[PDB]
Amino acid sequence: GSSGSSGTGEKPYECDVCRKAFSHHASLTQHQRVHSGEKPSGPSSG
Ligand SMILES: [Zn+2]
């Protein structure tokens, strides 16, 4: 039965940088900001 588990996952959304946990999906795509990440320059806001 379910006895031994390597905590595969505790949340549907986890940051692949700091391994954070959020309740909502967006909260994740938004937080990622704090991190630079490997992405090219996009359409600046304004
Ligand atoms: Zn993070």
From Swiss-Prot:
* Protein's gene: ZFP28
Give the intrachain disulfide bonds: none
Superkingdom per UniProt: Eukaryota
Question: So what does this one do?
Answer: May be involved in transcriptional regulation. May have a role in embryonic development.
In residue numbers, the zinc fingers (C2H2-type) are 13-35
Give the location in the cell.
Answer: Nucleus
Q: Where would one find coiled-coil regions in this protein?
A: none
Can you say what this protein is called? Zinc finger protein 28 homolog
Q: Which family is this sequence assigned to?
A: Belongs to the krueppel C2H2-type zinc-finger protein family.
